[PDB]
Design a protein around this ligand. Structure first.
Ligand SMILES: [Cd+2]
Ligand SMILES: [Cd+2]
Ligand SMILES: [Cd+2]
Length: 28
């Protein structure tokens, strides 16, 4: 789950897809 933000965070270069569980980016 969470194919990104597993160590830091991106949400800028498409770093996120869906499973992203990082509650640090304005993803959802
Ligand atoms: Cd993030
Ligand atoms: Cd995100
Ligand atoms: Cd992410």
């Amino acid at each position: 789950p969470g194919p990104c933000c597993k160590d830091k965070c991106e949400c800028a270069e498409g770093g996120c897809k869906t499973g992203c569980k990082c509650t640090s980016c304005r993803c959802a």
